[PDB]
Design a protein around this ligand. Structure first.
Ligand SMILES: *[C@H](C)[C@H]1/C(=C/c2[nH]c(/C=C3N=C(/C=C4\NC(=O)C(CC)=C4C)C(C)=C\3CCC(=O)O)c(CCC(=O)O)c2C)NC(=O)[C@@H]1C
Length: 496
């Protein structure tokens, strides 16, 4: 199917800082515990009810978790072990077979006084985030990392945006000062498999408290169909590849949280936190930050919204311009009079060739150069109503590709077989700091690949003759001008 996907879904292992016990909902008898249960809760049982193991108060709270409308709301429930007195945050969620109970020990009265302190810091931070004049995504991510770091204490926190490749880039970071900085570093789209990404869409915050710690096995009675869904569990164990990936990166413990937007929801980026030591932050702080991530996502959705607004606003003006040019008398006026085809679309140059004569503007090829590009175009591309590329080299055109570092991106529109419209752009500098590896599109997640990369040193890639890419908006502008000009030239043809 999809690589890794339920090797993680029903992994059958959890982390060492608490333990997960799944239970039938009307039996209240255990379908599954973990072999670290009976000691750290303070002792054992199997196929047993759970109200047995601590205060009848705690049973009041769990039965009232079970008949809640909306299980999700009562978390974090709080329990106290009869055999020990030990306090644990209980965190529940309903799955197929039943309900899952994650139990995280609380810290050792003295630090709940600071736990609430950082929860009020969390509201203050969400309101600070909403009190922000839009139109500045850099400022957004900066304030997000600063307040997540001051909330959680992690040594490194950053925002990691996904590119259309689903390869990612550290786009803002604040760190303990001694650590090497990962700002600017792009990483390969395969470091996070599409399985793990689409799975972040449902579960939105993951902590791992120590990678060098030995995971604990599940107990499942053998009657049950298979290892159950452990996606929802706070203390899920991590896949081995990502564990050694951490170890190699120098990140002992990490907190990493989705950043989501809703059109049917997609994953914009992550917020990722690194501790060089082991860190376990209590579930309240986790929940609060998840709200802060929600606010992140929504102020981003506002930035997107106004992107789209202003885009359609400039679409409107290129249509004022389309009319304006339908009014010029002769094709040459496309280039002749005030608003020319070099203003249709962001250009370095542009040109029209119509009937054996050359009408160019901006940075352009020669007459001989142009006719060679057209000889190539018709020789190979006779079936596509034009084309667009950001490197005539990479495209496959030999010749002026060599003779052009001032002309490297090209878009062209077939009017008829005889004559064409052209827009050109020069090379312009992209340097990319790759963090150990370049992203290879042809690579895609391999399920039984068991080992990760070894290094992460920066290295400059330099793309050496690329134009900025033609976006669909500029392509739409061109294509529609193409259509109206075919219409118009045969209107004139048949009038005369
Ligand atoms: C194994 C051969 C391949 C592999 C698998 C893999 N990766 C993940 C999950 C994550 N990978 C990252 C990557 C990063 N963490 C960082 O700090 C950075 C740089 C800023 C990167 C690029 C992340 C964030 C995750 C999410 C996991 C988490 O919650 O922290 C998984 C899923 C892990 C799981 O058990 O759920 C897997 C299977 N990664 C590789 O590199 C190999 C190609």
């Amino acid at each position: 199917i999809t690589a890794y996907l339920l090797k993680i879904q029903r992994g059958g292992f959890i982390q060492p800082f608490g333990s997960m016990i799944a239970v039938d909902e009307p039996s209240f008898r255990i379908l599954a515990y973990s072999d670290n249960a009976r000691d750290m809760l303070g002792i054992f049982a199997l196929g047993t009810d759970i109200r047995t193991l601590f205060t009848h108060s705690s049973a009041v709270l769990l039965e009232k978790a079970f008949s809640a409308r909306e299980i999700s709301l009562m978390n974090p429930i709080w329990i106290h072990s009869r055999t020990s007195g030990k306090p644990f945050y209980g965190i529940l969620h309903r799955i197929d077979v039943g309900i899952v109970i994650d139990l995280e020990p609380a810290r050792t009265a003295l630090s709940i006084a600071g736990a609430v302190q950082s929860q009020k810091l969390a509201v203050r931070a969400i309101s600070q985030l909403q009190s922000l004049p839009g139109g500045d995504v850099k400022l957004l991510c900066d304030t997000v990392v600063e307040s997540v770091r001051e909330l959680t204490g992690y040594d490194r926190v950053m925002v990691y945006r996904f590119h259309e490749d689903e390869h990612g880039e550290v786009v803002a970071e604040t760190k303990r000062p001694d650590l090497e900085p990962y700002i600017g570093l792009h990483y390969p789209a395969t470091d996070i498999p599409q399985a793990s990404r689409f799975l972040f869409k449902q579960n939105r915050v993951r902590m791992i408290v120590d990678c060098h710690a030995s995971a604990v096995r599940v107990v499942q009675d053998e009657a049950l169909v298979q290892p159950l869904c452990l996606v929802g569990s706070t203390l899920r164990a991590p896949h081995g590849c990502h564990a050694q990936y951490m170890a190699n990166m120098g990140s002992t413990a990490s907190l990493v949280m989705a950043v989501i937007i809703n059109g049917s929801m997609r994953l914009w980026g992550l917020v990722v936190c690194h501790h060089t030591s082991a860190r376990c932050i209590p579930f309240p702080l986790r929940y609060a930050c998840e709200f802060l991530m929600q606010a992140f996502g929504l102020q981003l959705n506002m930035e997107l919204q106004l992107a789209a607004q202003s885009l359609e606003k400039r679409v409107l003006r290129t249509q004022t311009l389309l009319c304006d040019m339908l009014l010029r008398d002769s094709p040459t006026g496309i280039v002749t009079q005030s608003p020319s085809i070099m203003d249709l679309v962001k250009c370095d140059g542009a040109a029209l060739y119509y009937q054996g004569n050359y009408y160019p503007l901006g940075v352009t090829p020669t007459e001989a150069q142009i006719r060679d590009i057209i000889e190539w175009l018709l020789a190979f591309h006779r079936d596509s109503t034009g084309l667009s590329t950001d490197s005539l080299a990479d495209a496959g055109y030999p010749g002026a590709a060599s003779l052009g570092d001032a002309v490297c991106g090209m878009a062209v529109a077939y009017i008829t077989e005889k004559d064409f419209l052209f827009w050109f752009r020069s090379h312009t500098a992209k340097e990319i700091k790759w963090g150990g590896a370049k992203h290879h599109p042809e690579d895609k997640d391999d399920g039984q690949r068991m080992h990760p990369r070894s290094s992460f040193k920066a290295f400059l890639e330099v793309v050496k003759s690329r134009s900025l890419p033609w976006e669909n908006a500029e392509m739409d502008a061109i294509h529609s001008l193409q259509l109206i000009l075919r219409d118009s030239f045969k209107d004139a043809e048949h009038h005369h």
